[PDB]
Amino acid sequence: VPRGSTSEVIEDEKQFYSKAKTYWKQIPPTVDGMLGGYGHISSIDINSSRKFLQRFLREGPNKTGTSCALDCGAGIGRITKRLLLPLFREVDMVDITEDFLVQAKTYLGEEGKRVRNYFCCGLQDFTPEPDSYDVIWIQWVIGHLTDQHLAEFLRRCKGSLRPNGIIVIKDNMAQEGVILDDVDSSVCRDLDVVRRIICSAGLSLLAEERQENLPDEIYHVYSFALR
Amino acid sequence: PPKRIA
Numbered sequence: 001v002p003r004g005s006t007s008e009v010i011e012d013e014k015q016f017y018s019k020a021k022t023y024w025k026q027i028p029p030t031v032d033g034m035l036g037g038y039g040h041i042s043s044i045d046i047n048s049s050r051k052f053l054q055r056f057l058r059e060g061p062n063k064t065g066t067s068c069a070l071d072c073g074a075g076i077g078r079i080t081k082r083l084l085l086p087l088f089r090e091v092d093m094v095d096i097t098e099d100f101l102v103q104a105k106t107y108l109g110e111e112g113k114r115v116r117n118y119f120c121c122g123l124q125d126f127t128p129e130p131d132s133y134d135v136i137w138i139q140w141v142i143g144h145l146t147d148q149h150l151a152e153f154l155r156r157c158k159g160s161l162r163p164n165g166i167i168v169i170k171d172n173m174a175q176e177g178v179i180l181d182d183v184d185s186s187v188c189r190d191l192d193v194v195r196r197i198i199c200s201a202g203l204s205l206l207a208e209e210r211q212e213n214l215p216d217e218i219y220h221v222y223s224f225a226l227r
Numbered sequence: 228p229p230k231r232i233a
């Protein structure tokens with residue numbers, strides 16, 4: 001029987017979070033650090049995310065705005081730099097690891113002057129300002145939250161969207177069930193689990209897409225656009 | 228991050 005929730009795989013919630021915090025504190029503040037030794041796939045990733053996002057930027061009644069985005073689990077700002085800053089007037093970043101947000105100020109260069117808020121906080125403790133963001137981008141971090149905290153964070157995110165705003169999740173997906181990585185202290189969830197969580201947060205899918213051109217050995221990665 | 232299937 002596959003596991004269907006984090007409550008089947010997490011022995012101790014406080015340790016699940018504290019171990020993850022310690023893990024990221026000892027990762028170098030680099031693209032290869034953000035990508036777990038896969039820094040080389042960054043351009044494939046960014047190109048695909050851009051195309052995915054541009055779907056929602058077309059003129060018409062539901063056009064997503066371009067005033068402000070929120071990068072969640074932003075790290076040093078890999079995605080902020082190459083995807084979001086070019087498209088959004090301002091960007092806010094949130095991440096638990098202070099050293100990454102400090103590095104971001106260097107990594108982002110001159111364009112980084114348009115990063116407004118650098119929030120150093122776990123997502124589980126973060127309440128984005130209501131009616132503030134056109135796009136909330138959540139990539140390679142949902143496995144760090146329990147199902148309850150993920151559902152709650154998504155509800156809070158919903159409350160922070162501007163009219164026509166969207167949430168984008170892009171992350172590793174398991175073929176089946178909920179799989180614990182006890183080294184980085186994270187989980188990988190199957191598509192049915194993630195969709196369940198999204199539904200419980202009062203959100204709906206606008207689109208879902210598998211990431212192409214990835215190394216064969218890694219978990220499949222999917223993007224979901226939500227409102 | 229992206230990672231090898233365990």
Ligand SMILES: Nc1ncnc2c1ncn2[C@@H]1O[C@H](CSCC[C@H](N)C(=O)O)[C@@H](O)[C@H]1O
Nearest residue numbers: 024034073075078095096097122123139144
């Ligand atoms: N509970 C939590 N809340 C917020 N950020 C977290 C977190 N647990 C881990 N993180 C952050 O999640 C990031 C994962 S690495 C991925 C960074 C970025 N999303 C990108 O794709 O380039 C790290 O910056 C780490 O500090």
